[PDB]
Design a binder for these strands. Structure first.
Ligand SMILES: Nc1nc2c(ncn2[C@@H]2O[C@H](COP(=O)(O)O[C@@H]3[C@H](O)[C@@H](COP(=O)(O)OP(=O)(O)OP(=O)(O)O)O[C@H]3n3cnc4c(=O)[nH]c(N)nc43)[C@@H](O)[C@H]2O)c(=O)[nH]1
Ligand SMILES: Nc1nc2c(ncn2[C@@H]2O[C@H](COP(=O)(O)O[C@@H]3[C@H](O)[C@@H](COP(=O)(O)OP(=O)(O)OP(=O)(O)O)O[C@H]3n3cnc4c(=O)[nH]c(N)nc43)[C@@H](O)[C@H]2O)c(=O)[nH]1
Ligand SMILES: [Mn+2]
Ligand SMILES: [Mn+2]
Ligand SMILES: [Mn+2]
Ligand SMILES: [Mn+2]
Ligand SMILES: [Zn+2]
Ligand SMILES: [Zn+2]
Lengths: 352, 341
DNA sequence: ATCTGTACATGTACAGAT
DNA sequence: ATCTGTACATGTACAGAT
DNA sequence: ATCTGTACATGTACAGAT
DNA sequence: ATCTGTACATGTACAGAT
């Protein structure tokens, strides 16, 4: 039923290995070049993030997310107009990206990008170009034409080892689920800043960064139970990741047909399900035999977020991803009707 | 009932503070002398172990265990007569690495430093053979002992005899196990019974387990449910201590026996709900039953070293074991009279 | 001669394949 | 049920540098 | 290399509520 | 009698500074 859908969504070991071998070649080579010279990004380290590395990538192994993180000691953060998620950075190889002590995201991203393009240019091993910059994106995106099309977001990131910013104090409400020790430990890991890089025309546009908890989200996905043995070989298997996939698929399929859904992304579904997992902590509430009622209750939750125009960042409570400012009421009522319809007619869109 | 017993066993915030301040003074000072002065034990680091640091110490804060661990480069181990737990070490004034030679110098230093402490009342206990410890007796108005335990630290994968040990897969899980087994392992100068023999120590791992003892991550946390696993451990420790005070026939038994047994019980009964505080009685009782079966069958395997039987004939006489069986059985079947002294 | 950043060596969880 | 490739963590060997 | 500052877990003690 | 909330105490990991 939904079992058969997940079978379709299941990646193939063969495709995984073909995609993985090529992607690793390129990434490895880019990462070397960032140190290989007296470059401003020497010391940058690699951290694989996103769905593929969380084992929730569906349909094909054709999008990979990688974080090129750089430790910046001695950092002063200033929150950008109470938004919660956006900051200026202040205070050395970075010398050339400063705006009198302020660190320009776009200056740094540009140099990062220029290097990447140069390195890609000198790869006649594999078929690979760099995608035209999209505004409001921190990524340098590689398009690889293995006989199959594969995208890789290379994401520049600052790494701070200090305590997380105050706006996250009330975030990550895992106490009743994964517990206090997991939370304290996670919050001792560093936090990450990535360029916002929009070209809206607003003040500080080019010097604004945004927080990233991709590393933490990865730990959670791969350690998702109240019982330590959830999904392990001497444990009981849950259906938490399976729900995540199914919901990801509903949004993808809808997004490929209807352009009224451009404002929506998978991060919305991931955020929503983090909330659901907090709300329903017990592994027994995600029993595989209850895949249907579980997926259904996730859908119901998501619709309520759309209806009430409210879906809080899981790490930054005050930052509403479903604000009027970010997504139109119309866009939200439109997605509400499409989800409601699919739900009440057997999920036609799963058969396409 | 047994709730009332635990109250008696509960340490007092005041005594904890007084004992802790004095113990830390001494340990801090010993640790400095090992490093800040040019000794063979130059890079030695501190790691607190045992009941007090596991929060299972009963009655009084009067015995403290501390490990002075030393990072020692790539070493070769060779198993001492198949026991599983005892090894010779190989590859500087202690050379094959003699446990006794090393322990002696370690001890000499400690004695010298203790000698020049006019701050606090503190002597060094007469050496007990087949003990890895230098034991300090501190006469705060209250008597307090501190085992300073020399330990070699190896970063290599654990020895082959432990491959089948630490059977936590159905309890704490495979990820916890793999991770724990990536931590280093420790060799302690316990003389085996000879003089160049070390013994493995998993005090660091036992500490993680005591403080992360549930199948649910929230066991005993502030947004979790409280279990009675540590309470059973205390109760069983107390039964053994009280019995040991009365009967010399029980000199061969120690709390490590009880701790080992309960590790097995926790493995056998993984679910936090099987250690519900409302079931303190049935839980303690089933622990007793398990321990008697170990005594009856003369078998209690080291939790980390399966082939090493702590209840072998070679280590404890049949008579000693039948004697403890009768005493435990009696206490059990008459409401634990011994808990009222 | 010693030291070291880099690459290899070892081990295992996760999940896909048989 | 067993087997197998990938990703990821930690230990160690070593050519090139000091 | 060593030390201090910070944050929070695991305790204990006790009052007021259930 | 037990539970819940607060205060008070110790232990411990790690970052940033010296
Ligand atoms: N892969 C992917 N790309 C999408 C999706 N919807 C739109 N896009 C593309 O994103 C570009 C513009 O950026 P955006 O802000 O609209 O989209 C981001 C981000 O790209 C998307 C999720 O992408 P991901 O990080 O690769 O996701 P993951 O690996 O978890 O799953 P999968 O890739 O399999 O879907 O979500 C948006 N987003 C918004 N806020 C955040 C945030 O804080 N973190 C992250 N990680 N993403 C965020 C355009 O090219 C557009 O086409 C989509 O569903 N998937
Ligand atoms: N504290 C204590 N001392 C005891 C006990 N029974 C006997 N002793 C004294 O130890 C001397 C040496 O004999 P032993 O080798 O049989 O004793 C050891 C060890 O002393 C004892 C447990 O001591 P601990 O490590 O301080 O205990 P823990 O901190 O877990 O709890 P607590 O101190 O609250 O009881 O058990 C014996 N033992 C045997 N194998 C091991 C092992 O692998 N590890 C450890 N740690 N101990 C082991 C005798 O002369 C006597 O005076 C006793 O119950 N407690
Ligand atoms: Mn992705
Ligand atoms: Mn992406
Ligand atoms: Mn002890
Ligand atoms: Mn001791
Ligand atoms: Zn699971
Ligand atoms: Zn517990």
């Amino acid at each position: 039923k939904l079992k058969k859908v997940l079978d379709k969504l299941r990646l193939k070991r063969k495709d995984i290995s073909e995609a993985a071998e090529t992607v690793n070649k390129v990434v490895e080579r880019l990462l070397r070049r960032m140190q290989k010279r007296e470059s401003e990004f020497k010391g940058v380290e690699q951290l694989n993030t996103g769905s593929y590395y969380e084992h929730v990538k569906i349909s094909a192994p054709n999008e990979f997310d990688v974080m090129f993180k750089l430790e910046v000691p001695r950092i002063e953060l200033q929150e950008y107009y109470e938004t919660g998620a956006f900051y200026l950075v202040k205070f050395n190889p970075l010398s050339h990206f400063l705006e009198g002590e302020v660190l320009s995201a776009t200056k740094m991203l540009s140099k990062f990008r220029k290097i990447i393009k140069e390195e890609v240019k000198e790869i006649k091993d594999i078929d690979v170009s760099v995608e035209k910059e999209k505004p409001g994106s921190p990524a340098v995106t590689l398009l690889i034409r293995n006989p199959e099309e594969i995208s890789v977001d290379i994401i520049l990131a600052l790494e701070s080892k200090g305590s997380w910013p105050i706006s996250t104090k009330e975030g990550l409400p895992i106490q009743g689920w994964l517990g206090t020790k997991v939370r304290t430990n996670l919050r001792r890991e560093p936090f990450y800043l990535v360029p916002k890089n929009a070209k809206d025309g607003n003040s500080f546009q080019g010097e604004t960064w945004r927080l990233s908890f991709s590393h933490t989200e990865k730990y959670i996905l791969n350690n998702h139970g109240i019982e330590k043995t959830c999904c392990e070989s001497s444990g009981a298997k849950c259906c938490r990741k399976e729900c995540l996939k199914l919901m990801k698929y509903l949004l993808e399929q809808l997004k490929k047909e209807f352009q009224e859904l451009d404002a929506f992304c998978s991060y919305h579904v991931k955020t929503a399900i983090f909330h659901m997992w907090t709300q329903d902590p017990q592994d027994s509430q995600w029993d595989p035999r209850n895949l249907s009622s579980c997926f259904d209750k996730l859908l119901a939750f998501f619709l309520e977020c759309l209806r009430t125009e409210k879906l809080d960042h899981y790490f930054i409570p005050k930052f509403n991803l479903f604000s009027q400012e970010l997504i139109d009421r119309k866009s939200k009522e439109f997605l509400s009707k499409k989800i409601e319809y699919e739900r009440n007619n057997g999920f036609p869109i799963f058969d396409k």
